[PDB]
DNA sequence: ATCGATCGATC
DNA sequence: GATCGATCGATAAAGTTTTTTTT
């Protein structure tokens, strides 16, 4: 995929090019290589892992042993240790047949003094999922989000990329500034919230697509 | 590393009024900041006829 | 201005 | 009837500061 450290096992060629368009003349060359091998830099579920935590399953403390875990440096503080790997421990979908269709998902936040590991507590819980979020300071916006009409390099045609609340389908969104983002939005997450859907209303098309999504959220004092 | 020279505001930064007056953001100076430094002017007799003799 | 295609003439 | 030569016709170009409503 694009997007990556590389490493290529290439050997070399050169190739002629056409000057006009319609002739078969030709002289400054283009070179490009040609890989032989390329390299970056449901798991198989074995058994030992199985009988390892179900002897830690034995042992009654688990609870505490989740507890010093989750911090390699952090102070103690053990009350905001329990919903933390609670929502790590995200429920599972409950849905009824006909009527309900709840989820077991939940929200937490927090808010206080600042800087104390506000952020970092946030990057230690996107170590501990690989398919996650990452917010930014306006690098989504309202319109930024989804919803997109981009006139992109390769085509000049529509494109629809999801939002990153779409894109935790299997995490949980990690989000920020809860004090400083704009009024614009704020107003849709309400129905991921509530409807667990974003409602696209663009000039492309109409969708109700879904999100299963799970949220935290991080604000700050004033 | 970031080295910073924010330029107040309107006049002279007023001592008597209240700081942040002319800075923008307050989360970067709480924690994501540790010293600050300043260029207050007092007009003084003796020092700046040094530093009009600094300059001259 | 150059290249390609079509038509005409010659063998 | 086929091949070669000559003549005629067709083929190549490029953009990104002012002005409108709107949030």
Do not use: W
Not at chain 1, 42 to 60: G, H, P, S, Y
Not at chain 1, 93 to 116: A, E, H, Q, V, W
């Amino acid at each position: 995929r694009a997007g990556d450290r590389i490493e290529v096992t290439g050997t070399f060629r050169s190739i002629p090019i056409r000057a006009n368009s319609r002739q078969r003349v030709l002289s400054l060359y283009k070179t490009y290589v040609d890989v032989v091998h390329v390299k970056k830099v449901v798991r198989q579920i074995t058994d030992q892992d199985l009988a390892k935590i179900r002897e830690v399953a034995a042992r009654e403390d688990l609870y505490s042993l989740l507890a010093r875990s989750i911090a390699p440096s952090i102070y103690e503080l053990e009350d905001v240790k329990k919903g933390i790997l609670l929502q790590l421990f995200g429920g599972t979908n409950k849905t009824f047949t006909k009527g309900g269709r709840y989820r077991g998902d939940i929200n937490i936040l927090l808010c206080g003094d600042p800087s104390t590991s506000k952020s970092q507590i946030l990057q230690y819980v996107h170590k501990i999922t690989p398919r996650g979020v990452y917010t930014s300071g306006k690098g989504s916006s309202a319109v930024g989000l989804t919803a997109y009409i981009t006139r992109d390099v390769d085509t000049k045609q529509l494109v629809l990329e999801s939002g990153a609340l779409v894109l935790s389908d299997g995490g949980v969104c990690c989000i920020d500034e809860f004090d400083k983002m704009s009024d614009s939005t704020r107003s849709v997450l309400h129905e991921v919230m509530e409807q667990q859907t974003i409602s696209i209303a663009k000039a492309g098309i109409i969708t109700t697509l879904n999100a299963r999504s799970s949220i935290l959220a991080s604000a700050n004092p004033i | 590393s970031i080295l910073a020279a924010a330029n107040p505001l309107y006049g002279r930064y007023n001592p008597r009024l209240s700081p942040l007056d002319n800075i923008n953001l307050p989360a970067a100076l709480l924690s994501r900041f540790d010293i600050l430094f300043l260029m207050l002017d007092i007009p003084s007799r003796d020092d700046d006829e040094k530093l009009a003799e600094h300059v001259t």
